[PDB]
UniProtKB/Swiss-Prot annotation, chain B:
Modified residues (Phosphotyrosine): Y389
Covalent cross-link Glycyl lysine isopeptide (Lys-Gly) (interchain with G-Cter in ubiquitin), where: K191
Residue ranges, annotated region (Disordered): 45-58
Pfam families: AAA, AAA_lid_3, Prot_ATP_ID_OB_C
Protein name: 26S proteasome regulatory subunit 4
Organism: Homo sapiens (Human)
Chain sites annotated for binding ATP: G180, P181, P182, G183, T184, G185, K186, T187
UniProt entry keywords in alphabetical sequence: Acetylation, ATP-binding, Cytoplasm, Deafness, Intellectual disability, Isopeptide bond, Lipoprotein, Membrane, Myristate, Nucleotide-binding, Nucleus, Phosphoprotein, Proteasome, Ubl conjugation
Disorder: Birk-Aharoni syndrome: An autosomal recessive disorder characterized by failure to thrive, severe developmental delay, intellectual disability, spastic tetraplegia with central hypotonia, chorea, hearing loss, micropenis and undescended testes, as well as mild elevation of liver enzymes.
PROSITE patterns found in the cross-reference section: AAA (PS00674)
Gene Ontology terms for molecular function: ATP binding; ATP hydrolysis activity; proteasome-activating activity; RNA binding
Protein's cellular compartments: Cytoplasm; Nucleus; Membrane
CDD domains referenced in this protein's UniProt entry, alphabetically: RecA-like_PAN_like (cd19502)
Curated annotation (Swiss-Prot), chain C:
Cysteine-cysteine disulfides: none
Assembly and binders: Component of the 19S proteasome regulatory particle complex. The 26S proteasome consists of a 20S core particle (CP) and two 19S regulatory subunits (RP). The regulatory particle is made of a lid composed of 9 subunits, a base containing 6 ATPases including PSMC5 and few additional components. Component of a complex with USP49 and RUVBL1. Interacts with PRPF19. Interacts with TRIM5. Interacts with NDC80. Interacts with PAAF1. Interacts, in vitro, with the thyroid hormone receptor (in a thyroid hormone T3-dependent manner) and with retinoid X receptor (RXR). Interacts with ERCC6.
Annotated organism of origin: Homo sapiens (Human)
N6-acetyllysine: residues bearing it: K69
Cell location: Cytoplasm; Nucleus
Known function: Component of the 26S proteasome, a multiprotein complex involved in the ATP-dependent degradation of ubiquitinated proteins. This complex plays a key role in the maintenance of protein homeostasis by removing misfolded or damaged proteins, which could impair cellular functions, and by removing proteins whose functions are no longer required. Therefore, the proteasome participates in numerous cellular processes, including cell cycle progression, apoptosis, or DNA damage repair.
Binding of ATP, residues: G37, P38, P39, G40, T41, G42, K43, T44
Gene: PSMC5
Name the record gives this protein: 26S proteasome regulatory subunit 8
Family: Belongs to the AAA ATPase family.
Curated annotation (Swiss-Prot), chain D:
Domain of life: Eukaryota
Protein name listed in UniProt: 26S proteasome regulatory subunit 7
SMART domains: AAA
Post-translational modification: Monoubiquitinated by RNF181.
UniProtKB/Swiss-Prot annotation, chain E:
Subunit and partners: Component of the 19S proteasome regulatory particle complex. The 26S proteasome consists of a 20S core particle (CP) and two 19S regulatory subunits (RP). The regulatory particle is made of a lid composed of 9 subunits, a base containing 6 ATPases and few additional components including PSMD2. Interacts with RPGRIP1L. Interacts with CRY1 in a KDM8-dependent manner.
Protein name: 26S proteasome non-ATPase regulatory subunit 2
Residues with the N6-acetyllysine modification: K473
Keywords associated with the record: Acetylation, Phosphoprotein, Proteasome, Repeat
């Protein structure tokens, strides 16, 4: 049936579906899992790496990348698209700071990255397929710590705790069970690591996971090797 | 459910190289065989009421098909004319063997029940049955070690070790494809299974399930699988399944739909509504990309074995096998052919060996040489533009 | 065509006449020959000469003879032909224009020559397969082999 | 440059380079083969069964049989009692392929028990009626009725809750609680086309309902509906539906119906029109100018894309049910059931296994469990583990992703 | 063809034969360059001088010594070996001073070897003077063979018609793999005592190369204890002496040599290997069975038998023994002693405690327990010997019936004169009972183990000379022949005198005597004439039954070496039971079992199953016990499953159920740790140990209805005496 309705982003199906958009959403699944948490003390991000074998340095599988001094970004999906949208995010944050001399709120930043992900095939901009990447922007704006999830179809929303990636449906349940509002960042780190361990194949061991935290204080902190060992 | 039939195979004298040990062993075979023949001839040559009863039995007994037995001594039978009769039942039948669809025996004149013929298997399937033991044991299968291990797990081990699976509730695989290029051993790995398997082996050819009469194909298939289940814990080798296995399409002709019907009946047999006994299906094909997911499914075909063009070590071992029985010359290093990464099949190695022997014979010699192998390869091999890469 | 005559003679005559040479060498008996060439360079005159000079049952299968309308007929015909050959062994089976009865295995289901393809598959199995042949030689001829199927 | 052996060259071949004990070995091989042939000639024929009985149950002086026999009935089906002409009824009969005769009654005590269709008796030369017989039940029609309940239940069809709910509704609920449908005023649908990707539990659901159903079940063998003798298939369909109507409450389970009837266009399919004809009979039975009775049909077909819209239209198939490549929870459940019976440690992450098997049919989940068992056996361990399962997954599901981090 | 140059060469040959003599010799002999050609067949001058063969032969006939007549013989003989011209002309040529073969080819070498062979067969012991030149020939050829790796052909010449030592003595070194294994196979299949000839030939090869842990096992194949000590003598390395002592037991520094020979620590090794993959678990019969998956004294016996067969020698009784009812005999006491096999330490205590106990069924069992425990282990402080020699000397059954089999268990395979003097005078049993005499013969033979002991042979002969006409042909008197057979194993044709002496026995009996003596004689080696005799003696129809039975058992015993022979015998036995009388059918399962004990091949399993559900209960029992024997000590799969199906089929059949449960117990026997297989070493030894037990078991089961379902049961514990570990 979907032989003439799902081969183009601009041909509606009888249901009213953008099947290329759902296919990009599926391509999100393939990626390595990420788990972002937002609590009263900041925002945490814990992601799984999929190191195939040594001789591939740690600093090429970029799941966490720093967005301004007050946001971190966890990627799930195609790397080229991830680079493009992270670059859009950085240039937007810095342009907003340049023009308004203030730190872009995470709502604004994820809104604008979504605004880029919107223009699939509009003849006023230049892509032709949805940016097949689902991103988590976890930052600290004037409303306290916040965490905003973006899906490839340009939809972004606040999330007090969200997991993305291959381990999406298998970790949303755990997050649902464990999360509670009055949570401290230490609890957030431990809980995210526990859920990652639950839904990974290799044994979590400080060189198959990345961790970062953006706090109402010290900037985005990427946990270093010794800190990884301590937490683990 | 009569029980396994398998095949009768005489023992295999271990030596192959021409040896007085081989002569002695083979004369051992000879003497025991002569002894068996003696016992037979001697005992069966040297060494009433039922006779007259079977005389009363109609001499030219016909065959009908029973339908709706009635009463204790009056059963309905049919005839090969489309007619049917309310025939009588004699006292010679064991009874309880008479079931609808049973091919019964009848008297020429009286047309009574005078037999049950619980042995009627279609000729097109009994000819396909295997009773020879083809001498291709797992010794001439150069390399292919992983494939042989998988096929052994599929076919042998739930016969010679039915404890591993029962120890942990798992159930053995039921089907295995062997798929790959033209000449890899997909049929040798079936021949060797026939050799070492004490279970019945059933030839099958996809081009043999397509029958002229409409609807006859999806009855020949049922006959085949019913014979397999009834007659043995057996193995069914559908060679060249690409003869019927093509993907089901809408089609607009009669023949294509009939072939698809044969496919559907095969699938219903492999995993239908009811169940499958201890029949293990081994299928063969040159292209697996042109088959229906219905039969490539992992419920009817639980294992798939590629037969990739053998690698360098396997190719070496294959030259070893197919030259072992030849008078080699010391000036022959079986590595000139190995090193070259030219597509070489197992059949291609066999043909190279044969052709090399032939070139020697033309040179008036009976022992191969390096130049002879070179010429054999060159005149045997049958069959991306430069600079487009690198 | 002296070299071609010598090669065809080798493959067909030498085994049936003198199997002992092959046995002593230890090499599997050659089992089939196939002829290339433009239209008018032997490829059936050689078959005619071989038939005229052979002491074995010569048979012809040339043409589209294996392609008959009713399904489940070509495979039966090829099988019964090889039954005839095995019965009257030793024998040489000629097949002119094998590309007709057996060529590239193109996809089927909608617009593929599935029936002639099945005929070819049965021929494949009978030439070589489980319970192979003893002294039946098969000669094939084709004016252009390019499309002739790899399994054959 | 090429030479052919001739004259003494060919004898020197096979005489010169040779072992002195070579002709002897060849001769003994040849005569071993010939002795194999001779022994197979001496023996290799079995007396067969032939249905001969054991003793103490036979009969001697059975000549009473073979003195009174041959009754060629079953070809008698009275079709017109000729009005009976009051006295001298003068029955008529059809022996089918043979002929149509007009016949009398002989030795029959009650010359009324013929009922005008009662499958009467008949003699060979003179066809006088002798005894009547009960109706005809085709052997195939009676064998199609699944009598052995399959050994599956509605707790092993994993990963399909909605589909099982719908199937259970249509098949069971009207049968075992008719109050609700009548009370609420909805006539329960009768007809369900189970479709989906090849292998998801379709036949398994069919088996489960067969196991749980207290009603007639007919596993219509697809190939027992395409015979020779044009019209036989339609007759088979009619007989199946007649047997159904005879039964109180019926569940027919036409499977692999893609064989029985796709489109209706002929072009070159004129020779294969008998299957089309039996398919038309199936339609007219499923619904036409006749109440169908308590008959509910669960057709199955992996490809409901070449089926005839006449058969598909929801006057005959009411609850077309798709089976979906099970989601993560369903895959969890399938893995869990298939590993229930295995020797697997008490700490395997079956959630993880479900995640690792994307868009995998339950058939492939079964395969993965069994290949995990195979790997455990090959390693010669009495307990497989999550690592063994992962090896099985890599073996089955997939059979480089450097850009989907 | 005849290329121009080829025809020129042919014309040169024509001129040479048509044409004084020195150039002719020179060029004609140099034309054998064609044969010497390293790369060629079809030597052209051979077959080019085909029409001239008669001319050359007649010229040689009308030739006299001189310049010619010397090198023309070479050409004459090569043209000969091509066609005609036998060893008369061959050796005339060789006397022509050309034996080197260097100027000739490997083809001529092999043809010469064959020609020498065929003249040797054509000749007899007369004209032996010609042999000596031919012996020098063979001596000249063999080095050429060891040069050009024709080791098979050299060994062919050696084995040819006779035995030869010079070559395999002078067969160099470090290249003996062929002369070792290939001649081992030839040995395995030889038909004559020139078997033993090749045996000590290979032994001499090993000795010359100073590496003989293969002549180690060859010693047993050589029925020469003197050769056993001869091999034991050198033993220059204590390290290999240890392994030799262990092998001898399984089949300088004097402190431990005798200890290892007697196997005082084999129990320790067995227990250590049990700890390795521990299975130590006192069990319950149902688990060996699966009755949950579906108190007669018969069930007691079945449970005891299965439990003992499974937990044998694991050191784990009166409480469960007490359930006795007539046939509730010493079976279970023997079962406890067996579960305590080879555990003399606690064996003494337990057996004493359970011997100071109730009536015969508790003391005879204790004595059998002592003996069966002592089986396989010896010590200077003889155990149980005092009890056996002092207790139970009165004339009666039960007591001595068990005690003598216990003594046989204690000291089988020893040929010890002390126990021989204990048992031979006590063999006098016309005073005692018939079964007692039978068991006395059993123990005497089981100790003789083919010793050819004249004294024990005389005892058996005099016992059988003591003849009661009605007693002989009733039952339970065949163990005199059994003991005679055990006293005489595989000695070859050295049985004719015994056969002539026995030929005085009555006609209806002594068929068993002759057949069992003959089979206990030559066997395992494989003699086609002998198996012909066995098959024919089966084949005479009798319108006796046990005579064909012993013949069948003999076919089994003889066809126990060559696996090729074993398979052909499987075929023959299928034919036998198919076209066979009920006695023959009953006997066939025993033969199948002997062919494949504890080696459960699907073919034998299938055939026995197909013959199981038979109208004759005796046939059924034989088939189900054959199943047990094929599955013994393997835990094999699907044997238990099909066997439980058989039991459920024979649900209410008492005897069938008992025997099938015994078959299941055999199936789980030793939990795999013990196997009944003979041929312990290289699967190539008619092991004097456990062959006596197996043969006794099979002879007894030749008639199961009378003895097994009678008043005796020690057959099973004889089979246990045959048992041996698989670790
Ligand atoms: N591993 C192997 N060792 C030796 N011979 C091999 C091997 N594999 C293939 N062959 C050759 O394969 C030939 C038989 O054909 P083979 O089984 O390879 O055909 P296929 O293409 O796999 O199957 P099919 O016969 O169905 O077309 C035999 O001559 C044998 O020489
Ligand atoms: N080398 C040749 N020597 C003799 N005659 C030849 C030769 N080549 C072709 N011919 C002639 O060709 C005819 C033989 O037909 P040919 O064998 O070429 O046909 P074919 O094998 O059936 O070919 P195709 O498939 O192209 O029809 C005869 O006229 C024969 O004289
Ligand atoms: N969702 C599922 N729940 C439970 N078992 C399943 C499921 N999917 C597949 N299976 C397994 O697959 C097998 C059942 O396959 P089934 O016969 O139902 O397939 P099908 O979809 O009808 O296939 P076909 O296309 O051949 O008709 C059983 O092993 C069952 O365990
Ligand atoms: Mg093949
Ligand atoms: Mg032509
Ligand atoms: Mg199905």
């Amino acid at each position: 049936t979907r032989s003439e309705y799902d081969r183009g982003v601009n041909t509606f199906s009888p249901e009213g579906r953008l099947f290329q958009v759902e296919y990009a959403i599926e391509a999100i699944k393939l990626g390595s899992t990420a788990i972002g948490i937002q609590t009263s003390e900041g925002v945490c991000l814990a992601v799984e790496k999929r190191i195939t074998s040594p001789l591939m340095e740690p600093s090429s599988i970029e799941k966490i990348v720093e967005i301004d001094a007050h946001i971190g970004c966890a990627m799930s999906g195609l790397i080229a698209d991830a680079k493009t949208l992270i670059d859009k995010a950085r240039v937007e944050t810095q342009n907003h700071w340049f023009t308004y001399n203030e730190t872009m709120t995470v709502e604004s930043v994820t809104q604008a990255v979504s605004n880029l992900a919107l223009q699939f095939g509009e003849e006023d901009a230049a892509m032709s397929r949805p940016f097949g990447v689902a991103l988590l922007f976890g930052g600290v704006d004037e409303k306290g710590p916040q965490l905003f999830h973006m899906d490839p179809s340009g939809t972004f929303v606040q999330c007090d705790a969200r997991a993305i990636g291959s381990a999406s449906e298998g970790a949303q349940s755990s997050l649902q069970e464990v999360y509670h509002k009055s949570m401290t960042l230490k609890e957030a780190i431990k809980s995210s690591l526990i859920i990652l361990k639950q839904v990974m194949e290799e044994k979590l061991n400080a060189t198959n996971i990345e961790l970062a935290t953006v706090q109402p204080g010290q900037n985005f902190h990427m946990f270093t090797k010794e800190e990884l060992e301590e937490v683990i | 459910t009569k029980g396994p039939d398998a095949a009768s195979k005489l023992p295999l004298v271990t030596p192959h190289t021409q040896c007085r040990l081989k002569l002695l062993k083979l004369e051992r075979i000879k003497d025991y065989l002569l002894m068996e023949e003696e016992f037979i001839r001697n005992q069966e040559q040297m060494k009433e009421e039922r006779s007259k009863v079977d005389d009363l039995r109609g001499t030219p007994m016909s065959v009908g098909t029973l339908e709706e037995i009635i009463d204790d001594n009056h059963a309905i039978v049919s005839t090969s004319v489309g007619s049917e009769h309310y025939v009588s039942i004699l006292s010679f039948v064991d009874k309880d063997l008479l079931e609808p669809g049973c091919s019964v025996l009848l008297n020429h004149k009286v047309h009574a029940v005078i037999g049950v013929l619980m042995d009627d298997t279609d000729p097109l399937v009994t000819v396909m049955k295997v009773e020879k033991a083809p001498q291709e044991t797992y010794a001439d299968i150069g390399g292919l070690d992983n494939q042989i291990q998988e096929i052994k797990e599929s076919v042998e081990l739930p016969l010679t070790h039915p404890e591993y699976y029962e120890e942990m509730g798992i159930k053995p695989p039921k089907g295995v494809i062997l798929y790959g290029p033209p000449g890899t051993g997909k049929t040798l790995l079936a021949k060797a299974v026939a050799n070492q398997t004490s279970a019945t082996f059933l030839r099958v050819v996809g081009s043999e399930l397509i029958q002229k009469y409409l609807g006859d194909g999806p009855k020949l298939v049922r006959e085949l699988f019913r014979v397999a289940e009834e007659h043995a814990p057996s193995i069914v080798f559908i060679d060249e399944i690409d003869a019927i296995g093509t993907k089901r399409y809408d089609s607009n002709s009669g023949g294509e739909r009939e072939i698809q019907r044969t496919m559907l009946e095969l699938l219903n047999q492999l995993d239908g509504f009811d169940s499958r006994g201890d029949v293990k299906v081994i299928m063969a094909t040159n292209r697996i990309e042109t088959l229906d997911p219905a039969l490539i499914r992992p419920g009817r075909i639980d294992r798939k074995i590629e037969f990739p063009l053998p690698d360098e070590k396997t190719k070496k071992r294959i030259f070893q096998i197919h030259t072992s029985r030849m008078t080699l010359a010391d000036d022959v290093t079986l590595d000139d052919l190995i090193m070259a990464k030219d597509d070489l099949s197992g059949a291609d190695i066999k043909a190279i060996c044969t052709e090399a022997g032939l070139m020697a014979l033309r040179e008036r010699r009976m022992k191969v040489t390096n130049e002879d192998f070179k010429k054999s390869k060159e005149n045997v091999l049958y069959k991306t533009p430069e600079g487009l890469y690198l | 065509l002296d070299k071609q005559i010598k090669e065809i003679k080798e493959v067909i005559e030498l085994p049936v006449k003198h199997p002992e040479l092959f046995e002593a060498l230890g090499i599997a008996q050659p089992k089939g020959v196939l002829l290339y060439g433009p239209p008018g360079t032997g490829k059936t005159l050689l078959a005619r000469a071989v038939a005229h000079h052979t002491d074995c049952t010569f048979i012809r299968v040339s043409g589209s003879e294996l392609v008959q309308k009713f399904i489940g007929e070509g495979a039966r015909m090829v099988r019964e032909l090889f039954v005839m050959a095995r019965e009257h062994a030793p024998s040489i089976i000629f097949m002119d224009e094998i590309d007709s009865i057996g060529s590239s295995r193109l996809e089927g289901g909608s617009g593929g020559d599935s029936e002639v393809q099945r005929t070819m598959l049965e021929l494949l199995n009978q030439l070589d397969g489980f319970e192979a042949t003893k002294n039946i030689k098969v000669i094939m001829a084709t004016n252009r082999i390019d499309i002739l199927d790899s399994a054959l | 440059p090429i030479r052919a052996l001739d004259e003494g060259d060919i004898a020197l071949l096979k005489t010169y380079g040779q072992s002195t004990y070579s002709r002897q070995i060849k001769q003994v091989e040849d005569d071993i083969q010939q002795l194999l042939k001779k022994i197979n000639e001496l023996t290799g024929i079995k007396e067969s069964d032939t249905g001969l009985a054991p003793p103490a149950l036979w009969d001697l002086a059975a000549d009473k049989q073979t003195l009174q026999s041959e009754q060629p009935l079953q070809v008698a089906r009275c079709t017109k009692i000729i009005n009976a002409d009051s006295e001298d009824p003068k029955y008529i009969i059809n022996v089918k392929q043979f002929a149509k005769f007009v016949v009398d009654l002989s030795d029959q005590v009650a010359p009324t028990d013929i009922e005008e269709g009662m499958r009467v008796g008949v003699d060979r030369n003179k066809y006088q009626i002798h005894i009547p017989l009960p109706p005809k039940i085709d052997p195939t029609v009676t064998m199609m009725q699944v009598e052995e309940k399959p050994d599956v239940t509605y707790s092993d069809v994993g990963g399909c809750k909605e589909q099982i709910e719908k199937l259970r509704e249509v098949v069971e609920t009207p049968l075992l609680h008719p109050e609700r449908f009548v009370n609420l005023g909805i006539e329960p649908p009768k007809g369900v086309l189970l479709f989906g990707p090849p292998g998801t539990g379709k036949t398994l659901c069919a088996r489960a309902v067969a196991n749980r159903t207290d009603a007639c079940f007919i596993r219509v063998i697809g190939s027992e509906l395409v015979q020779k003798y044009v019209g036989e298939g339609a007759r088979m369909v009619r007989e199946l539906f007649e047997m159904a109507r005879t039964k109180k409450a019926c569940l027919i389970f036409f499977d692999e119906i893609d064989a029985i009837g796709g489109a209706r266009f002929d072009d070159g399919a004129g020779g294969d029109n008998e299957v089309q004809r039996t398919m038309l009979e199936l339609i007219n039975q499923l619904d036409g100018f006749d109440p169908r009775g308590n008959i509910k049909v669960l057709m199955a077909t992996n490809r409901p894309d070449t089926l005839d819209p006449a058969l598909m239209r929801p006057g005959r198939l009411d609850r077309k049910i798709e089976f979906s490549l099970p989601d993560l929870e369903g895959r969890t459940h399938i893995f869990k059931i298939h590993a229930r019976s295995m020797s697997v440690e008490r700490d395997i992450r079956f959630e993880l296994l479900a995640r690792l098997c994307p868009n995998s049919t339950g058939a492939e989940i079964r395969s993965v469990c069994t290949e995990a068992g195979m790997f455990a056996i090959r390693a010669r361990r009495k307990i497989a583990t999550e690592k063994d399962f992962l090896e099985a997954v890599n073996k089955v599901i997939k059979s480089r992703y450097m850009t989907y981090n | 063809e005849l290329s121009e140059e080829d025809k020129q060469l042919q014309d040169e040959l024509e001129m040479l034969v048509e044409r004084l003599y020195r150039p002719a010799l020179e060029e004609l002999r140099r034309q054998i360059r064609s044969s010497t050609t390293s790369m060629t067949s079809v030597p052209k001058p051979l077959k080019f001088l085909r029409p001239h063969y008669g001319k050359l032969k007649e010229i040689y006939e009308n030739m006299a010594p001189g310049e010619n007549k010397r090198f023309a013989a070479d050409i004459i003989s090569v043209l000969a070996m091509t066609m005609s011209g036998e060893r008369e002309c061959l050796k005339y040529r060789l006397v022509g001073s050309q034996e080197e073969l260097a100027s000739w080819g490997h083809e001529y070498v092999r043809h010469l070897a064959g020609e020498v062979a065929k003249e040797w067969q054509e000749l007899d012991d007369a004209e032996k003077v010609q042999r000596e030149p031919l012996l020098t020939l063979v001596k000249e050829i063999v080095p050429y063979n060891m040069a050009h790796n024709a080791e098979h052909e050299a060994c062919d010449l050696l084995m040819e018609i006779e035995q030869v030592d010079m070559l395999e003595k002078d067969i160099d070194e470090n290249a003996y793999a062929k002369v070792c294994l290939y001649l081992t196979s030839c040995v395995n299949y030889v038909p004559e005592p020139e078997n033993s000839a090749l045996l000590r030939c290979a032994l001499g090869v090993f000795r010359k190369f100073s590496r003989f842990p293969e002549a180690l096992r060859l010693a047993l194949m050589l029925n020469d204890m003197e050769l056993v000590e001869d091999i034991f003598t050198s033993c220059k390395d204590v390290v290999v002496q240890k392994q030799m002592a262990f092998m001898l037991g399984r089949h300088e520094e004097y402190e431990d040599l005798t200890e290892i020979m007697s196997n005082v620590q084999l129990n320790s090794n067995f227990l250590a290997l049990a700890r390795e993959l521990d299975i130590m678990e006192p069990k319950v019969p149902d688990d060996i069975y699966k009755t949950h998956l579906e108190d007669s004294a018969r069930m007691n016996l079945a449970s005891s038998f299965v439990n003992g067969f499974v937990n044998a020698a694991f050191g784990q009784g009166n409480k469960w023994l007490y359930k006795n009812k007539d046939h509730g005999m010493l079976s279970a006491a023997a079962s406890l002693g067996m579960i305590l096999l080879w555990d003399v330490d606690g064996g003494l205590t337990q057996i004493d405690k359970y011997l100071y106990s109730s009536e015969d069924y508790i003391k005879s069992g204790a004595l059998l327990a002592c003996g069966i425990v002592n089986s396989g282990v010896r010590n200077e402080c003889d155990p149980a010997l005092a009890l056996l020699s002092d207790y139970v000397l009165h004339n009666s059954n039960t007591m001595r019936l068990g005690s003598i089999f216990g003594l046989g268990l204690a000291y089988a395979g020893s040929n010890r004169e002390d126990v021989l003097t204990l048992l031979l005078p006590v063999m006098g049993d016309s005073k005692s009972s018939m079964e007692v005499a039978g068991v006395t013969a059993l123990a005497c033979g089981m100790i003789a183990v083919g010793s050819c002991n004249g004294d024990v042979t005389s005892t058996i002969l005099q016992t059988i000379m003591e003849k009661s006409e009605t007693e002989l042909k009733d039952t339970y008197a065949r163990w005199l022949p059994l003991g005679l057979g055990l006293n005489h194993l595989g000695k070859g044709e050295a049985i004719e005198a015994i056969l002539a002496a026995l030929e005085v026995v009555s006609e209806p009996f002594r068929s068993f005597a002759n057949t069992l003596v003959d089979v206990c004689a030559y066997a395992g080696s494989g003699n086609v004439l002998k198996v012909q005799q066995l098959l024919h003696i089966c084949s005479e129809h009798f319108d006796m039954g046990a005579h064909q039975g012993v013949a069948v058992l003999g076919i089994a015993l003889i066809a126990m070496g060559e696996e090729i022979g074993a398979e052909m015998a499987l075929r023959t036995f299928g034919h036998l039971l198919r076209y066979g009388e009920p006695t023959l059918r009953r006997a066939v399962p025993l033969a199948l079992a002997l062919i494949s004990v504890s080696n459960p091949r699907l073919n034998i399993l299938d055939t026995l199953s197909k013959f199981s559900h038979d109208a004759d209960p005796e046939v059924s029992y034989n088939s189900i016990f054959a199943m047990g024997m094929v599955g013994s000590g393997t835990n094999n799969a699907r044997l238990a499953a099909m066997l439980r199906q058989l039991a459920q089929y024979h649900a209410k059949d008492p005897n069938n159920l008992f025997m099938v449960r015994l078959a299941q117990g055999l199936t789980h026997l030793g939990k795999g740790t013990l196997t009944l297989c003979p041929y312990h070493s290289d699967r190539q030894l008619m092991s004097q140990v456990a062959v006596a037990g197996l043969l006794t078991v099979l002879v007894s089961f030749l008639d199961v209805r009378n003895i097994i379902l009678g008043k005796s049961h020690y057959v099973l514990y004889g089979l246990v005496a045959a048992m041996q570990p698989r670790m």
